[PDB]
Amino acid sequence: QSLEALNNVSPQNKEALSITLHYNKARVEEVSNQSEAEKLYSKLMEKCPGYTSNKIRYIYLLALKSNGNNYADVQQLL
């Protein structure tokens, strides 16, 4: 319902609220299915590379999948 109502948001805050809602939906997916969570994580990272929680969660999921074989990514994020 929040995503449906996002169409009525003012354009100034529309980008920020869309990023927030997409992050929340990606969290719900990560609870349900990690693949869609990672997809939305990539979508938001392309949309806003400056955000940290998205990158943290994406790298954390990658480390879970790669058994901590992305130490370079963690160092770069640090």
Binding site: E15, A16, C48, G50, Y51
Partner: peptide, 6 residues
């Protein structure tokens, strides 16, 4: 520096 991030 991004006003969006702020």
């Amino acid at each position: 520096d991004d006003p969006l991030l702020k």
